[PDB]
Design an enzyme around this catalytic site. Structure first.
Site, short mmCIF file in Angstrom:
data_model
loop_
_atom_site.label_atom_id
_atom_site.label_comp_id
_atom_site.label_asym_id
_atom_site.label_seq_id
_atom_site.Cartn_x
_atom_site.Cartn_y
_atom_site.Cartn_z
N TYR A 14 -11.79 -2.45 -11.60
CA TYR A 14 -10.69 -2.63 -10.64
C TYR A 14 -10.45 -4.11 -10.32
O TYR A 14 -9.31 -4.58 -10.37
CB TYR A 14 -10.97 -1.83 -9.36
CG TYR A 14 -10.02 -2.15 -8.23
CD1 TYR A 14 -8.80 -1.50 -8.11
CD2 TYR A 14 -10.36 -3.10 -7.26
CE1 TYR A 14 -7.93 -1.79 -7.06
CE2 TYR A 14 -9.50 -3.40 -6.22
CZ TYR A 14 -8.28 -2.75 -6.12
OH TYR A 14 -7.44 -3.05 -5.08
N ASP A 38 -5.28 -0.70 3.51
CA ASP A 38 -5.50 -2.09 3.14
C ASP A 38 -4.49 -2.96 3.89
O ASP A 38 -3.31 -3.04 3.50
CB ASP A 38 -5.36 -2.24 1.62
CG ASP A 38 -5.77 -3.60 1.09
OD1 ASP A 38 -5.84 -4.58 1.85
OD2 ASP A 38 -6.01 -3.69 -0.14
#
Length: 125
Positions: A14, A38
């Protein structure tokens, strides 16, 4: 469901994808009904289109770098956490964020939930 070793691999991957800025490859790591928080504390976004839009906004600017700042911590139940740093540009000036990403993977090895811990105290411009 990824083993602890497989979690280490996936979460490192990732970061690699964020670093090179491969939006499509990032989105494919997520389950189709995944949620992203986030920064953690903000309302979650849901599903691959919303997640795609999020990464396009963040990385579409072109010049973003990301790296692990320590090892991936992995569990035996398909979850993990990692410390990383993102470097971007808002101002023409270099800025950076120190963050921690917590992920839960599903039984297909896709990200079911991602939570990124950071706030302005972790920001430098």
């Amino acid at each position: 469901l990824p083993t602890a070793q497989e979690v280490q691999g996936l979460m490192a991957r990732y970061i690699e994808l964020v670093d090179v800025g491969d939006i499509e490859a990032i989105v494919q790591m997520y389950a189709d009904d995944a949620t992203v928080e986030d920064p953690f504390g903000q309302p979650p976004i849901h599903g691959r289109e919303q997640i795609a839009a999020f990464y396009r906004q963040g990385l579409g600017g072109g010049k973003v770098r990301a790296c692990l700042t320590g090892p991936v911590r992995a569990s035996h139940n398909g979850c993990g956490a990692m410390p990383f740093r993102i470097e971007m540009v808002w101002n023409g000036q270099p800025c950076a964020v120190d963050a921690i990403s917590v992920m839960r993977f599903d039984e297909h090895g896709r990200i079911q939930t991602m939570q990124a811990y950071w706030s302005e105290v972790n920001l430098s411009v």
